[PDB]
mmCIF file of C-alpha atoms in Angstrom:
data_model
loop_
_atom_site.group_PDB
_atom_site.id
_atom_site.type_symbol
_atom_site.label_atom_id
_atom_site.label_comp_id
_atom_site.label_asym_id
_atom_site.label_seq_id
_atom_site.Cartn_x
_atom_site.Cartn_y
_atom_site.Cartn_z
ATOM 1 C CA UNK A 2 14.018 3.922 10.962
ATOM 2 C CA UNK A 3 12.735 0.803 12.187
ATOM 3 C CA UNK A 4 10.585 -1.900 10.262
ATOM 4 C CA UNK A 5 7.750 -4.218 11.491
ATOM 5 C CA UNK A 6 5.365 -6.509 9.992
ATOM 6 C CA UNK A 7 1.554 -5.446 10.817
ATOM 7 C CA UNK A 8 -1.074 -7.402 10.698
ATOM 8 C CA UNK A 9 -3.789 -7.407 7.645
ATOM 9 C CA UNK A 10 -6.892 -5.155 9.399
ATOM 10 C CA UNK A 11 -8.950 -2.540 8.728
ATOM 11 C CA UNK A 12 -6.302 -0.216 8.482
ATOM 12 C CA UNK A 13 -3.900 -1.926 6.682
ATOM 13 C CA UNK A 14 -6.640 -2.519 3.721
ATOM 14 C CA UNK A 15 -7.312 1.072 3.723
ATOM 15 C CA UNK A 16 -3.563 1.701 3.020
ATOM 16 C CA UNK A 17 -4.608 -0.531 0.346
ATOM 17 C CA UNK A 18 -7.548 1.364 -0.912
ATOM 18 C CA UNK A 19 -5.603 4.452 -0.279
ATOM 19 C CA UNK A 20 -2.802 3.019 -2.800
ATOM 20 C CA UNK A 21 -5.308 1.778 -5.209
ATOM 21 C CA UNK A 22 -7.325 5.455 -5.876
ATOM 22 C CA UNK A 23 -4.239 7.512 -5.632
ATOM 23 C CA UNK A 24 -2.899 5.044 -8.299
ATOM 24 C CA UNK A 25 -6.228 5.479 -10.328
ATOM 25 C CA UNK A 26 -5.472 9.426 -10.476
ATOM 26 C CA UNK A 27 -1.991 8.651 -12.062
ATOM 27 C CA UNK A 28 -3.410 6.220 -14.557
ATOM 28 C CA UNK A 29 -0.270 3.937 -15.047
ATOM 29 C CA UNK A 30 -2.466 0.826 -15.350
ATOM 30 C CA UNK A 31 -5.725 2.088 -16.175
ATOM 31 C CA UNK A 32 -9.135 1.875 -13.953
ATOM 32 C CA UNK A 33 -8.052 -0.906 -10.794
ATOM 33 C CA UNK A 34 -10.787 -1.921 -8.464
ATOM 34 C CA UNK A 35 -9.421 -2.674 -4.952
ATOM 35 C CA UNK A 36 -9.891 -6.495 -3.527
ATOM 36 C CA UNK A 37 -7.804 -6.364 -0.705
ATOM 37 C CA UNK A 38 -4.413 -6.250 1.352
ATOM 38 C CA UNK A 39 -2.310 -9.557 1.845
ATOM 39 C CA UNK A 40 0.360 -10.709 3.669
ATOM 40 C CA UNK A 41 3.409 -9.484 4.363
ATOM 41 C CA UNK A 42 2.794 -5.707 5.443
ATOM 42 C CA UNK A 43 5.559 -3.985 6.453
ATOM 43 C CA UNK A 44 5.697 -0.606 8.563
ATOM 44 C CA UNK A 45 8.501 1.780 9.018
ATOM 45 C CA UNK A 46 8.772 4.262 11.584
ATOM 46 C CA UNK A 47 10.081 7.961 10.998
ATOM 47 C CA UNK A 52 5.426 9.917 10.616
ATOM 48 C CA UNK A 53 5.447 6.260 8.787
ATOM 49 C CA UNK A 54 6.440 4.331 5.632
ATOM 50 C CA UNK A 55 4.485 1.504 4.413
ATOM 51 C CA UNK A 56 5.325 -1.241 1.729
ATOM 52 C CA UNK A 57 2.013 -3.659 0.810
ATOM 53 C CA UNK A 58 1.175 -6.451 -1.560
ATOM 54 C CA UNK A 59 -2.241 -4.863 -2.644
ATOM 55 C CA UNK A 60 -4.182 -7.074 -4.973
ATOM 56 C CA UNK A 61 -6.593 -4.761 -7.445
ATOM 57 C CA UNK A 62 -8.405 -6.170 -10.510
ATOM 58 C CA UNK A 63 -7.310 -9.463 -9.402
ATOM 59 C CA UNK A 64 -3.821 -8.597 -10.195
ATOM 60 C CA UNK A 65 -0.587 -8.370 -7.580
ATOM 61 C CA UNK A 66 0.718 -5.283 -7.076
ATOM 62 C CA UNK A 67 3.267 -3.434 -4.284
ATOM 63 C CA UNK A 68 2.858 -0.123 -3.025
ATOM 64 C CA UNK A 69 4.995 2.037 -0.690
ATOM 65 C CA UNK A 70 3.448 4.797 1.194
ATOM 66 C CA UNK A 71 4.381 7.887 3.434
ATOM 67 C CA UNK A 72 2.309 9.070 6.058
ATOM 68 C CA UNK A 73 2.664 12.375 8.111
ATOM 69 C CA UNK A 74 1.038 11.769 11.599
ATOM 70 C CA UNK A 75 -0.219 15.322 12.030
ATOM 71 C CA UNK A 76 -0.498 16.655 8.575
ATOM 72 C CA UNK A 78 -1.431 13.676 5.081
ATOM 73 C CA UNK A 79 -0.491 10.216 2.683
ATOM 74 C CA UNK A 80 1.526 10.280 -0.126
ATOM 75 C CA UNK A 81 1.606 7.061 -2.425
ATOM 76 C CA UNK A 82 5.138 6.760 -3.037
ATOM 77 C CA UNK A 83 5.402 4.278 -5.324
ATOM 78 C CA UNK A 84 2.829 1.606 -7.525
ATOM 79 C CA UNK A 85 4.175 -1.260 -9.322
ATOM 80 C CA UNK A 86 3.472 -4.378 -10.721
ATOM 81 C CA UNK A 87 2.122 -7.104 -11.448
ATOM 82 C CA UNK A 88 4.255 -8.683 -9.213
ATOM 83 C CA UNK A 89 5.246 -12.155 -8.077
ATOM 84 C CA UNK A 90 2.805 -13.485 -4.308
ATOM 85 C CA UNK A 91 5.347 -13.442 -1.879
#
């Protein structure tokens, strides 16, 4: 149940985009267009867990994020604005 920072590539902004259209389905804040993935990223191992800083309509928000390696991603949680890191 170990956590690393990742770097900011390709796959880390398509956690990001991930986050950002799941979050449009829910509908807490409305229609969000996806700008990109900052720094830090973190990544969990259990089959992962991800927390981003996601920045969508030029606004801050963090997302966490399960992933099943064999299965399917789950957007755990969406919140925000929040504060840069």
């Amino acid at each position: 149940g170990e956590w690393e920072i990742i770097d900011i590539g390709p796959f880390t902004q398509n956690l990001g985009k991930f986050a950002v259209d799941e979050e449009n389905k829910i509908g807490q804040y409305g229609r969000l267009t996806f700008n990109k993935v900052i720094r830090p990223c973190m990544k969990k191992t259990i089959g992962y867990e991800y927390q981003l800083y996601v920045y969508a309509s030029d606004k801050l928000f963090r997302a966490d994020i399960s992933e099943d390696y064999k299965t399917g991603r789950k957007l755990l949680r969406f919140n925000g604005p929040v504060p840069p890191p």
